[PDB]
Ligand code: HEM
């Protein structure tokens with residue numbers, strides 16, 4: 001029966017590899033509308049003209065587990081926006097946390113493997129995560145951030161989105177500035193709770209919206225700042241912490257609102273291809289090493305997952321060149337004082353911004369995680385934590401030793 | 405940096421497609437030991453000689469969801485055993501339920517799609533399952549069976565395994581018989597509860613064991629039985645139901661016991677390839693259409709999932725030929741009286757083997773599912789259920805109409 005063989009052969013070739021990271025996700029469609037004037041810093045045609053409208057497609061996701069896993073676990077959430085303009089698609093691959101774990105792109109597979117299930121039993125492994133954290137001290141900021149309530153608080157509608165990098169916005173005269181934009185949720189602070197919530201909201205006629213803002217830094221003032229704006233593991237301070245770092249102001253650009261979901265999930269959402277290399281006229285990448293790695297990695301990954309196999313910029317001074325040359329040196333992969341300064345200030349500022357219960361919950365979550373690892377790794381964890389704050393390490397250890 | 409590009413390229417090509425069905429699973433190693441004499445019905449070298457021992461490899465799994473999904477959901481569980489004998493690998497691809505949903509292999513993709521998430525929202529869909537059941541009346545037996553406690557009762561250690569087909573065991577003189585073997589659990593009746601249970605049991609020195617039994621049917625007595633032994637949607641009665649069908653006796657063969665888990669899950673368990681076409685000397689397939697489809701489907705599926713792309717039998721009488729010719733006819737895909745007889749007898753015998761609470765639980769489980777489908781499909785479900793038993797349909801409808 002050739003017909004039965006044809007049916008079975010077509011059925012046998014349906015599934016394709018899932019994404020290396022952010023495998024589980026959901027999609028929707030909407031539009032972007034320009035509401036403010038940014039013509040003095042921008043020349044992108046999509047953002048020129050108040051009331052201009054551009055169609056878009058969005059894909060929300062989780063981070064570390066597989067396609068069928070849960071969405072209410074402690075993790076980072078992603079939001080990838082594809083915009084169809086008059087010059088081509090322009091992609092915004094964003095995260096819901098202002099910073100990232102590492103700053104050296106060569107450490108990415110180790111971080112991903114440390115966040116993946118046990119290589120032998122396919123079960124959860126906190127030990128790999130804590131060993132990675134104790135070996136890499138630039139992940140301390142993100143680790144302290146993720147064990148607060150922020151790691152288990154957002155769904156797809158209440159989460160925000162940060163591009164986390166620096167880009168260059170070039171004017172027609174050859175000048176440019178360092179920029180960083182993000183989206184602020186208008187409606188925010190079972191393995192499919194977030195997916196169900198988003199689709200029910202879209203069904204009941206309520207259209208979620210986001211506010212888009214941009215922060216601008218002059219190239220000649222970047223070398224004189226108190227932190228490296230090319231270091232993706234740090235964040236541009238907007239008013240919370242650290243107190244001694246001046247605030248970088250923001251302007252408003254437009255608004256993004258979502259209307260209608262997918263009709264075929266696999267064809268329209270799963271097989272979508274995003275990449276930071278998708279740019280338009282007026283925007284170029286910065287000198288971030290991780291951005292340079294991402295400019296290559298995404299098309300290469302899509303060649304395997306979706307493959308057939310199944311204006312000259314102006315020149316700056318010598319100070320800018322010296323400041324930029326730091327990203328390619330032996331010391332770039334070694335910790336500095338800021339790697340301990342950022343989590344320390346976050347810990348010190350938690351009680352004032354949220355209260356003592358927030359801090360206590362962070363301590364409890366850290367201890368519950370650390371209670372499942374061997375004793376020597378526990379001692380290493382306490383020693384590493386004492387570098388951020390003595391009180392934090394003391395409390396975490398005193399509360400962990402009563403739970404083993 | 406060629407080194408960074410090499411690292412990222414190697415990382416980008418790690419994941420491969422998952423299996424079309426039974427994507428989530430666990431593995432272990434053990435051995436099979438022959439304890440009884442079957443030399444009068446068997447010529448397979450693996451089963452000749454008491455005390456003979458053969459290495460083994462097992463892969464347990466769930467049925468309908470993806471790799472990262474849960475294992476405590478209502479589903480069918482599989483157990484695939486690979487044996488390394490002196491003539492080659494011999495595979496036993498088994499299920500934990502004595503029968504299967506359908507009887508015509510051409511309906512397999514529709515059943516699989518009806519059991520898969522919603523094609524547009526990627527959420528659960530009972531409506532597709534109930535529409536499929538109402539369109540195909542040979543799945544009523546399995547549907548009634550699966551909504552009892554048996555659908556949410558077993559883990560990987562307490563579950564049993566049935567090959568569910570008929571095979572031919574050929575003697576050196578050219579004679580043969582129809583056989584059907586199975587494994588009886590010696591120790592039985594969060595998305596990784598069964599996996600964790602199995603690995604913890606293997607970590608404490610307790611080795612799970614299974615008992616292997618065989619049922620033998622003479623070729624000349626098969627045409628005169630009350631049920632088609634070539635129909636995979638029916639089961640060989642061992643003493644429970646139906647009362648009016650005589651019991652087919654069983655003999656003992658050996659025992660299978662498991663010792664050691666995997667060292668690398670992805671390389672040793674995930675990339676394992678099973679197929680009913682893996683046979684040895686002394687065993688040949690029967691005339692089952694679904695078995696014939698499975699003999700082709702599995703290597704074809706493995707060509708895509710794991711591909712480089714990322715003794716003459718004796719002749720029987722005319723009665724046997726006439727009885728065998730039924731599997732290739734227009735009436736094979738249409739329901740008969742037995743498709744309603746089997747679920748009716750199971751329902752009628754449920755009060756006698758487990759009690760009335762078992763029956764009530766089945767009714768409640770059915771109605772919770774039927775409460776989530778539109779009204780016309782509900783009416784169709786009640787009409788279809790009334791063909792098995794009027795009381796069952798009446799109770800299910802009276803309980804469902806109070807929950808919508
Ligand atoms: C060296 C650093 C990184 C590498 C090599 C990397 C690599 C990848 C790869 C290979 C994918 C799969 C995309 C596909 O197959 O289409 C992916 C997805 C994704 N990554 Fe990155 N990543 C890095 C860091 C980051 C950063 C800094 C962010 C956010 C600021 C991020 C956010 C995301 C998101 C949101 C997705 C989901 C895209 C989608 O839904 O298709 N990753 N990443």
Ligand code: HEM
Nearest residue numbers: 423426463482483484498499509512567568678697701705
């Ligand atoms: C026309 C009928 C059927 C077809 C076409 C079919 C097809 C498949 C396919 C394509 C796979 C994936 C295997 C691989 O990619 O290596 C699979 C796996 C499996 N099937 Fe079937 N199936 C059918 C009926 C059955 C029956 C009757 C049983 C049990 C009696 C069964 C039990 C299993 C099990 C346990 C696995 C897991 C194998 C593993 O762990 O690798 N299926 N099936």
